[model samples]
Target: NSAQRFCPDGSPSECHEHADCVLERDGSRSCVCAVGWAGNGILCGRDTDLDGFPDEKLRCPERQCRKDNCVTVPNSGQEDVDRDGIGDACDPDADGDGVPNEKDNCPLVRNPDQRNTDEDKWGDACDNCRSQKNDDQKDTDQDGRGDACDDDIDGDRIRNQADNCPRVPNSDQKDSDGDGIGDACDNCPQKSNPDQADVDHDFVGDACDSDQDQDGDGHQDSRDNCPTVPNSAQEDSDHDGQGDACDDDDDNDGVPDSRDNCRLVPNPGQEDADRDGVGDVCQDDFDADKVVDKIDVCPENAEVTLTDFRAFQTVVLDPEGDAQIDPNWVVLNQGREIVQTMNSDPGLAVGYTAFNGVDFEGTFHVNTVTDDDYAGFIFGYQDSSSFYVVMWKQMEQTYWQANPFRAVAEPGIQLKAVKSSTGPGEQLRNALWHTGDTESQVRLLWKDPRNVGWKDKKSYRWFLQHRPQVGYIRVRFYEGPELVADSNVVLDTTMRGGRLGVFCFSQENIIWANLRYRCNDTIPEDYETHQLRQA
Candidate 1:
């Protein structure tokens, strides 16, 4: 067994099988240096030429070492071309390009291709006579006298001196245009294009490129001032760089063509009367509604935009509530229930949006029935003193109370028009209809051959529809769920586009609630249902 080979710091000779073990004077032992070793005796190595590979090693461990390929010189890679384990640094053919270096004519340089065109020992990469078999590669007269160039054309059998294309065969020696360059050398061969200005940089020169007008203005490329643009006149209005045919700002104004409202006329100021983007100078109809601008009011709207123009909007009494009376309404005075009228005169609750056709419905409670007077709804309410009204009087009355003139009280669900002298005259007392100076006359009545006055101290659900197309108006009253009153069919065209609102004349505490309306240029849902009813 090689059990004695390991060194536990006891016997130095056992460090390596060949290492010497010596006893120290202090009763300790050490591994003595071996024959080719240098290091602490336990881990030994020897490298003679300081190469990366060591010649020998004697380590106390499984230390790997390799044999040095070159010992006298430092061959870091230790390249051995012949794999004889003898590196190139010490071998005879150390500098290898190709072949054996011992017989290379260019011994100082590489000869990797091994090519000697002249059959000389020196390779073409370093040969003096690269092609010809010359000893000096020199000539006294310097006209290639001593050179052995091919005298005969290889295929045509024509000698070099007489051949027009010396290297390539052209037996005719043809130069068609008499320019010195042969057809093989010229792109535009028929024309004498000496400098060969191929402006388009394609296969042919501009001089003989038959399709030469680059932009097809009919002028040849060599003569056209604007070669890339179609400018038959070549009108340089600025008299400078680019022609006016391609100028973006033809009017010479600072504004571009896209930004100019009056483009060709050069109105840079671009002031418009209506400011609707069509410059005033050029617009036939500024609003572009086809209605002349001078006659169109709300020019931006195109005659109220036809239908759904004002947007579908809602109003609130919210079971008849109130805040500070917002801009949502224009009223005589504001109180609870969206309004509570205390006046004997016609008390109006005016809506903000004007109506052409209407669908207004609500519940009206006779909170007082104090005077047994009139309280109904008003639609088409135009000027402050002029509006169409539909009134419900509880009973018919005599009109000569103060000895009135031109007056009578024919009540009971009457549709009337009121166009009074405005400007607040002698204030009305308990007067219901018109007082002499004012104007109020019945337009239509539910009962002319008959009339039914509303019962007192109850609420009625009322639905009103007004269509101005042929001036059609309908009013209906429901008692709880049953139909109580219906104004057959009435017509009026004198007023439309007026506000829809509720009215009270000498009637108190008429609490109108749950009010709603929608207006548009639409036919009412019940328009054909009635089919013109007769009692």
Candidate 2:
């Protein structure tokens, strides 16, 4: 009879408060705080985000993580009212309530349900003018009451009984032209146009309106692009000075705008047989089908919804031996889980369904480790030789232990683009495992500035978003719903997109479990699939 692997019989549950309990394959029990956290298995600290997802994933993984949404504040619930990925705790807006903090009326508390009984500057939640919609906020007499509630409208030391200008400060009670209007408060003091018939509303009465050009642009009430605004240059003529400055025919199409049909594009022969003033060369329709880009699901291909990446969306690995796993994948200890691994050699599992845009989420764990090497994902994969990879290293290591002077690979994370013209079939793999290749093709894009490594015996949630359309890659790490670390965006023209897959080098037992994915580039197998392919 085998004795218990990790039990002494009758002991307290050994894991700390902020740690995970793991049951090894041998039924051994172990505990550890998620990556980005520190603890002794009995006590833990520095869950920095307080969002269950520890901050140890990346102390400053590219300056911050993605999911905690807010690293400096406590908001485990992740209330992002605006759904901007920026949580309300530290969001620039009020509660991320879609209302900017500076512009928010109820600044103290959050109330996206903007209610205002008086329609005043303040909201009902924290209203100053709770009653009698006191607008304009003019405090004429400087009392506790606003101008609307103040009896002494102006503080000229006079009562409203005989004050000529009840809302203006006129120290002397002199009436102009024997009328009740005070000269200091009158629009036309000498003229006495009591109604103040200033037709243009230029602050001058008809008796004193000089009819001067308001904008003083030398053109009075002109009707060009600069009609009533101050434009230093004249814009009322056909010779628009700013026109050709930038909007010239960049296509060098020879034909001018008036009848070029495809005015700013390359069309040696404009084909607008429809004669609707639109040319075929510049038509919104990408394919022969008449559907346009604004409504066509796949503008380039026409008539079909394109969703290119879905190999891992549905579980494709089988646990039973008879139905052997694909050559691209490996069976892990967790029979239900799918992974890519072999040994010291690089392990890669590619999905044929290529995607330029994809969101992949999966759980990764080192059931066992080998050379203490790298594990991560492969993206923008044109072939094994040319692709971009974001690999996670366990610690700083050297190619040759004898040469401890230099670090061949640092801990934490490294996101790079690999390419080789000579087809050094292993250049992409070797560059990650040993870090010895200095090929001009191997490009190191970014790394975890803090160099924090992943913890052993712990499971991690890794989310990868690849958008070749916009040339951006974002990686986020979580321990369940709590987001621990997220890589800063890598925004630049990276590479031509291809297939996507998971990768492991030297880390023998890294299993990518519950792999889930989706993409907008997938082409569905509708009735039109074959016909569209023929076209």
Top candidate on lDDT is 2
Looking at model 2, report the run of 10 residues with the lowest lDDT sum. 314-323
- Tens digits of lDDT, candidate 2, 1-535: 5232233333445655555666532235566555445444444545543233344433323212234555434343445666676765457784555567767876446677878888786676655345757544456666555666666678787866678788787879777665566877776677767677866333456776554444432223422234344332221112343222133443356665455555444576877667666567547653324654444433433223232232332111112211132224543322224554344445456655444456666666665545566788776665444567778878777744323123277787777776644333333334554443445446677776667777664567777776554456677777544776766566545453555677766566565654555544332233244334655
| Candidate 1 residue runs with Cα over 4 Å from true position | 1-343, 400-406, 421-450, 525-535
lDDT of each candidate versus the true structure: 0.51, 0.53
lDDT of 1 by residue, 117-177 (tens): 7876456766544677754333322334333444643333556676544554566667777
TM-score of each: 0.34, 0.36
Error of 1 at 340 (Å): 2.6
| RMSD in order of candidates | 51.8, 30.8
Which 10-residue span in candidate 1 carries the lowest summed lDDT?
Answer: 327-336
Badly placed stretches (over 4 Å) of model 2 are 1-328, 331-337, 369-371, 401-407, 425-429, 434-439, 520-535
